[PDB]
Nucleic acid binder design. Sequence first.
RNA 1: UUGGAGAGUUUGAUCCUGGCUCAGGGUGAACGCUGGCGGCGUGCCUAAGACAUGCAAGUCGUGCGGGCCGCGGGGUUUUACUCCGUGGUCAGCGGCGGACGGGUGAGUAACGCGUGGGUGACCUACCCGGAAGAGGGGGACAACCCGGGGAAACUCGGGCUAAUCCCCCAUGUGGACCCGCCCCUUGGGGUGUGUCCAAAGGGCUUUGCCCGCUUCCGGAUGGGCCCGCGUCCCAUCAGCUAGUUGGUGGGGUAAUGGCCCACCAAGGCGACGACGGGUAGCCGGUCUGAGAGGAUGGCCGGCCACAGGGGCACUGAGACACGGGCCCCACUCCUACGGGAGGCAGCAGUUAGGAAUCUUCCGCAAUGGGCGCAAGCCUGACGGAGCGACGCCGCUUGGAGGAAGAAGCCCUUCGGGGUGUAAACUCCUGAACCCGGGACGAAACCCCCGACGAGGGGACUGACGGUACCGGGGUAAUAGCGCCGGCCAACUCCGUGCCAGCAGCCGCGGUAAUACGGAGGGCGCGAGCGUUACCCGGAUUCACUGGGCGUAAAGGGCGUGUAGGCGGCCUGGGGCGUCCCAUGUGAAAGACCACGGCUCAACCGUGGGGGAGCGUGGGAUACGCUCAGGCUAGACG
Lengths: 208, 99, 104, 83
Amino acid sequence: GRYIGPVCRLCRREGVKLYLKGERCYSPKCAMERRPYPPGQHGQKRARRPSDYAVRLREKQKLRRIYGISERQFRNLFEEASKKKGVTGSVFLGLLESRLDNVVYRLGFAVSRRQARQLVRHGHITVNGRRVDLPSYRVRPGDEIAVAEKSRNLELIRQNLEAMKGRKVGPWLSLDVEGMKGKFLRLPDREDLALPVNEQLVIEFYSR
Amino acid sequence: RNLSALKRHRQSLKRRLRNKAKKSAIKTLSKKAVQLAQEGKAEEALKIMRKAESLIDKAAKGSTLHKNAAARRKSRLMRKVRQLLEAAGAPLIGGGLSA
Amino acid sequence: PKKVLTGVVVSDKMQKTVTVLVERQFPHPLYGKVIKRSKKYLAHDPEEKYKLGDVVEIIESRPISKRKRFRVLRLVESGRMDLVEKYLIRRQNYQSLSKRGGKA
Amino acid sequence: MVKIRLARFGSKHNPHYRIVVTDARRKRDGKYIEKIGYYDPRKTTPDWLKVDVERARYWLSVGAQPTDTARRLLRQAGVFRQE
RNA sequence: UUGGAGAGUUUGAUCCUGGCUCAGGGUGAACGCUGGCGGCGUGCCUAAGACAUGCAAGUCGUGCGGGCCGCGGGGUUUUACUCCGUGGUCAGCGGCGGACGGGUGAGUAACGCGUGGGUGACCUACCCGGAAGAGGGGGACAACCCGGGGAAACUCGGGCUAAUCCCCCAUGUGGACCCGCCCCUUGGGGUGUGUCCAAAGGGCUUUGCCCGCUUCCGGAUGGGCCCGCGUCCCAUCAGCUAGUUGGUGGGGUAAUGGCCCACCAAGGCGACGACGGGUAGCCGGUCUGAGAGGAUGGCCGGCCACAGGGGCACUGAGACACGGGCCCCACUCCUACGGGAGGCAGCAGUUAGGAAUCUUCCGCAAUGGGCGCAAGCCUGACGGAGCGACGCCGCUUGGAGGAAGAAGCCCUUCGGGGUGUAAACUCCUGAACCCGGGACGAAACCCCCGACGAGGGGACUGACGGUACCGGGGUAAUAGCGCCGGCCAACUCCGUGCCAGCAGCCGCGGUAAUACGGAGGGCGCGAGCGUUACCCGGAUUCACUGGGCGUAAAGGGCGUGUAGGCGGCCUGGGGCGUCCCAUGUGAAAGACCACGGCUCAACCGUGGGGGAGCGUGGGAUACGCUCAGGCUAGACG
Ligand SMILES: [Zn+2]
């Protein structure tokens, strides 16, 4: 049960816009537009001061819910991010951004993250020549993440790339629209991420 | 529920007897050669020791006498003899005795 | 390498055999201070040479009797009862501290 | 009679062997004497077999009948090539 | 320096002490609600209870002789009888394997295990290497035939006979024992005289090649014994011991040894905890922990121990021998009541016990092992499948668009808010499912050429499995559980009324319940979620790190001094502790880093690095220790 349910309910609980739908979470309605109050009968109510755990909590959630990954995998990542030399936080984000599904998002082959996963589990994604249906696949640097020959003629992918003429791609990635390809240059750096999170709060969270 | 892996037992018996008739052989001859040196029979004593020393090494040839086993046997007999023959010196033959 | 130890002959009641007090020192496995433990090894004197209060070296040898796996190597320093006394008094104190009957 | 043979170390359907030298009487997956190269049935890597003849010849020299399959691998290594 | 989070609770209120409780991580789990998929792993933790059935070690006719059933062929004019070759089948004699592999943890607190050592106290089948030899003579017993006993299991007796079975004799390269000497130095090596000891044959491509045989030195591997250190709780267990400790001789073993016996002696151990009791296989590792430490030792690996309970030995390189033997005991079964037959702690399974732990599956293809010249036989070792959400890891139940927002359900200050982009509806993709193709693992032994060497060529052979996997087509296609007073993320209505009930702790509930029960809503996690149990953690609450004792629990009623601990200034020696260096060891697997393998990961491979402890050698000498010399500030006169 890798989630899948009401989405802009979370765009709402966190108070921060969560780009979970791509188009539409741009039209007067990711819900945060005009309705920032959280879900429930009690949305419009005055919110008491959030206890230390509380803040650490929601800040962890904001991260997790963004990539939409099951805590089980999220945790595991964090665990393996701690065994690596480097900054226990920036290194986290590194792996997170190293996910096949995620990459397809940044590469622009998909409207949103959610849509990206499907693109993979239905096999519309090549990698160094062989397809791949497992999103948890970690893309190493210098990989040729592409599109299924078969899937190039798609009413979806096609309408997406058409949009990529105008948008710049993540500084650590390259893409050849004319050929629906794209590479992973290097592990992006924190100073290269735009997230509205606070890693420190996420790390703090795991030491309770 | 029979097993043809009992022939071993069927055979052990044959060896049990086998070894037995050989060891007891020794025991007896040794115990014979010994009593001789007591009386001082410097001739036949060595005549028997010799029959002993032969039997012994012959049992080591097989599975009867472990190996070094035979050796003990030999050392324990010759040494036991010589010492006795001090009561009546002069070995007539000089068979099983270097000097 | 056959183990070699050093100690004092504290018992001289046995035939060809002598009891040796062997002191050993070492840092405690958790409390770190140097604790001093010890052991009696039954040596083996063929010629009845080593006497009480003599410091001798022990050397691992071919088993000889039940509990007597060492021969005496050489003598270190003759003439030193002071050590033996200690062994003795401790023994004496052992006669006390029981449930038979305490007196003065 | 010490032999020279394989040893399972892969996993269910992922067999990875260990050419080693050990007393006949021990197990397949048992304490060996001196491992001398490995062999991979499936050959997933370009480097699917190694031997170090130097040692391999020690043993045979000393007296260690190898396996039918084992010998085969040692032959590929060039354990016995007297050219 | 890649590493350490706390909260609730004694009061009217405060601070300290202090106990209780909780949040975390973990499991060979079990129970509840729910339950789709795959990979890998794992699954009696209790009665070491009892166990039907089947299978779990055998294999050689290139060691020897035959029985049964049958075929072919010879000597016979013919008949009967007979001779050779042969297929099948059976067992026997003999060799090798059964002492491995598989299980299990009862016992065991011990040189049992860990670690480092010793063996001038040792053995070691088959393998490897090197040296020497196989000369002559004879014997026994099964099978088989004849007879007797018994209900049975099985047994007795008489007779034949082969062999690589057995025994004699000679040769002796050599080897053994006594005695002497030389060297060494615990039973090590050289040597001299005396004495004693060897051996089988079989097959072919049969004048040579293969297998096997004998003695001896060496090797390799495997193992016996022995020593230092380490090894749980109780002192409401304090003295234990008579082969007991030692000695001489003798026995016995591969061999040291009170191991055993005889005699001699009077010893040996204990508060550095003897003995007694309780408990428990040990370890590599594993869990937790900031670490120290605590807990653990199933799966895998190493060592040990038992194979219904106890005893014993045989045979053998090896056993005191799980599916060999002798005896006693308890149990179960056959019984003509004399007497017998049994041992799943092998695989599967049965039943019992229990909270609880699987299929009487597939295969011998692979890896290994036994026997064989080989073809090959055996191989519930093993490789595979199956069952269990028991763990872990990966996967799905869809994606994009879509109202100032439907209905229904809840809340209302009745105006409206909420569930909610959620739905509906639009399009797109397409697990399942369908067709086709379809695997690595597997290349050897063998055979041929070559010299049965090297080298080269040829053949056979998969349980998994038609599975993975690739191609094509293809349906929008499971969700649940805990929780929402504080700790602790999540608040309203109603029902109720110290009731019914919750509850880890504090507590909640007697008509206004964010704490009971439903509901909407919310948080958390997701094929799972809770629960109980148990380990470590929080707990520096047994305190080495890292605690305390005026009144919180805690100075002994006081002194005396035993053992022990601890100790002043200068000089030197030794250098035991102590520190530095080099070296051997510290198996493998695991952990760690790195690279790679299976679409990822779990899982796996390969390579690197690290280490405490101990052995040996070398060094240092402040400080501790020790010996020596000297002092006077402690002490004493
Ligand atoms: Zn949105």
